[PDB]
Enzyme design. Sequence first.
Site, short mmCIF file in Angstrom:
data_model
loop_
_atom_site.label_atom_id
_atom_site.label_comp_id
_atom_site.label_asym_id
_atom_site.label_seq_id
_atom_site.Cartn_x
_atom_site.Cartn_y
_atom_site.Cartn_z
N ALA A 45 0.79 -1.23 0.00
CA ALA A 45 0.00 0.00 0.00
C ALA A 45 0.83 1.28 0.00
O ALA A 45 0.26 2.36 -0.13
CB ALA A 45 -0.95 0.00 1.20
N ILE A 84 2.01 2.07 -7.51
CA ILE A 84 0.70 1.65 -7.98
C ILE A 84 -0.37 2.00 -6.95
O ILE A 84 -1.43 2.55 -7.29
CB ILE A 84 0.70 0.14 -8.29
CG1 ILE A 84 1.47 -0.16 -9.60
CG2 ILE A 84 -0.72 -0.36 -8.35
CD1 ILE A 84 1.64 -1.67 -9.85
N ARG A 132 12.92 -9.02 -7.82
CA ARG A 132 14.17 -9.73 -8.00
C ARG A 132 15.31 -8.91 -7.39
O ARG A 132 15.50 -7.74 -7.74
CB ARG A 132 14.43 -10.00 -9.48
N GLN A 158 -0.46 -15.65 2.06
CA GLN A 158 -1.61 -14.76 1.96
C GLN A 158 -2.89 -15.53 1.62
O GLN A 158 -3.96 -15.20 2.13
CB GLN A 158 -1.34 -13.63 0.96
CG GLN A 158 -0.23 -12.72 1.45
CD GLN A 158 -0.05 -11.48 0.61
OE1 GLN A 158 -0.70 -11.31 -0.42
NE2 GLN A 158 0.85 -10.60 1.04
N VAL A 195 -2.00 -8.61 -8.62
CA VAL A 195 -1.27 -7.73 -9.52
C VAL A 195 0.22 -8.07 -9.53
O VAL A 195 0.85 -8.03 -10.58
CB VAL A 195 -1.50 -6.24 -9.15
CG1 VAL A 195 -0.61 -5.35 -9.99
CG2 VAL A 195 -2.95 -5.86 -9.34
N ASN A 207 3.80 -9.68 -9.79
CA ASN A 207 4.34 -10.72 -10.66
C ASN A 207 5.08 -11.81 -9.87
O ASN A 207 5.57 -11.56 -8.76
CB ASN A 207 5.28 -10.11 -11.68
CG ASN A 207 4.55 -9.67 -12.92
OD1 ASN A 207 3.60 -10.33 -13.35
ND2 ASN A 207 4.97 -8.55 -13.50
N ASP A 211 -2.34 -5.34 -20.06
CA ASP A 211 -2.03 -5.84 -21.39
C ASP A 211 -3.21 -5.59 -22.33
O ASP A 211 -3.04 -5.08 -23.45
CB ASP A 211 -1.69 -7.33 -21.35
CG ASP A 211 -0.61 -7.68 -20.32
OD1 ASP A 211 0.49 -7.07 -20.31
OD2 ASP A 211 -0.83 -8.63 -19.54
N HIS A 227 0.58 -13.40 -17.91
CA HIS A 227 0.90 -11.96 -17.84
C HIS A 227 2.42 -11.84 -17.98
O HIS A 227 3.17 -11.68 -17.01
CB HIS A 227 0.39 -11.36 -16.53
CG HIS A 227 0.78 -9.93 -16.32
ND1 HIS A 227 0.49 -8.93 -17.23
CD2 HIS A 227 1.43 -9.32 -15.30
CE1 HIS A 227 0.95 -7.78 -16.78
NE2 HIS A 227 1.53 -7.99 -15.61
#
Lengths: 326, 326
Positions: free
Chosen positions: B13, B17, B93, B113, B130, B132, B160, B188
Amino acid sequence: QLAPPVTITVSGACGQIANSLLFRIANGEMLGENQPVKLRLLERPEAMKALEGVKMELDDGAFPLLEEIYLTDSENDAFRGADYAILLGGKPRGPGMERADVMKDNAAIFKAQGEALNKQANGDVLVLIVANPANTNAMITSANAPDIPPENITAMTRLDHDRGLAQVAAKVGCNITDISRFAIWGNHSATQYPDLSFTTIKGQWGLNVINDEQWITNEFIPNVQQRGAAIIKARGKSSAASAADAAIKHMHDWVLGNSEWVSMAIPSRGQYGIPRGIWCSMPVQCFGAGKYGVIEGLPINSFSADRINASVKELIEEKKIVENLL
Amino acid sequence: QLAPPVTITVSGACGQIANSLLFRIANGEMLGENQPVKLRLLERPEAMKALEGVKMELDDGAFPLLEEIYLTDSENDAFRGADYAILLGGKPRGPGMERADVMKDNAAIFKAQGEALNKQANGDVLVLIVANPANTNAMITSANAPDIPPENITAMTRLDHDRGLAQVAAKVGCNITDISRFAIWGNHSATQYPDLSFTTIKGQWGLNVINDEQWITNEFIPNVQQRGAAIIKARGKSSAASAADAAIKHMHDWVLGNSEWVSMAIPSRGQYGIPRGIWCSMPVQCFGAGKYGVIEGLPINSFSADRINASVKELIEEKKIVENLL
């Protein structure tokens, strides 16, 4: 069912405020779900490569209402046919920049933008100044746009206003919609006067903390004045998202109206004896379509007059600093 | 007139984004103007001081619909009473991490989670992943949430999808609303298959570039796959604002419906012969109230089948790498 498109110019379009603002114009929130919009995005020459990225992300929103995105570093091109203008770009106060130099450097920018607005924009254009010093920037813009009604150029105190509502809601424990008749007087600065004198909490006619002048003086007013600094201390960056949010609300209410009191920094016609020729935040009712009216009939007590005068003092001082460029 | 409140948990949060997402939840855009919201905001322990800044900015939005903002670094506390969860947080990463480590470390996050979601959230909770690797993270979440219907946990390919819509509109010169029947198949990732096989453009019935398989193969598909890298090259930062926009659109359509095809990465029940047990993006219709259905009856040509198979292959390889978190 869709209205004809309107054109919005936004300067500083690469910044963090624009990053939040632009998506909430393109989504139809600012002007309405049936109002197609064209964006004219203005940036400095060296930021043009980054502004292409801004257009890419906006296109990637796939917004049905966004009919066009125009990019430019030319203020004359930016304001062509503009119906609305949100001026985010300016010169920020950096370390070791004198206060007068920041005011004068911004005066030259808003002199140029006022001139371009006057030449290129539509006759009924509404201009919102967000960049600091907002009130003075708005005044300089209007002084250099003799064919724009001064009242169509305002400066944003809406973030101060909303921050005040948030303090009240947190202190009283009410909903935002329970609060009525709140206003910010004066400069968009630390001398602002967040005014609870007429404020009401729905149903609460008796004992209430917003009547407590000790709490008003020692907590509420300083908390609102220093709220920007507190967010910087917590996040390490300034409050870009809430500033964009306040911009959206200011324009939305200006265009579509709001039955509640809102704050806008507007050209002083001497309402409440405020010196003429400065832009000063006052309680207004927005009737929509760019028309607003200062709230009338308010008795100003001596605690208020003192606080308003302190902010008027600073606005006069700012005006003298840029007075040779009017 | 106002509905009873719903609770939305958002991880990551404090991120970029989230900075765009939360205000477009609090404003009523994601779930509707008459739906009060409570935000349960989750972050890493070391970001809690900054998260207080997030709450401050949201409060300063003066949102009537925002009934509560709860902050925590505990997944157990975060998901208590969740009706909705948007999972932005993950492990990027970093040093010592290979591609496989990125998959396994994030699977460990989403195993935890899913476990918390299954225990704490409300029974009808809708979960959007959301972070990755999205499809695989969603699969791990669901595998560790046996009492959540797998269809109530999806991964986001809406960005996308919207990027494809923008490529069409820019190339053809049409409005976004002129485009119909577009979809993203697969992971994705760069193996996604943006599928123009069924797409229509209002009014354009003859020569049109979206029929041209060489343009699809050599420009359209790679431009859609590589769009994130293009924004980073232009702006110097990733496309946080449009990813937040896609999340708003994904959740909004999931809850309130959308008459157009949208793309969602969903649990495969063997639609179009796709292997079961992976999450795979498909053309779907969102009917609202959490219910969606894959578009049925589509004839899949050999060019499409090849591309879909390539992405399915990647999804299967991802699943084998994280299989121990099942």
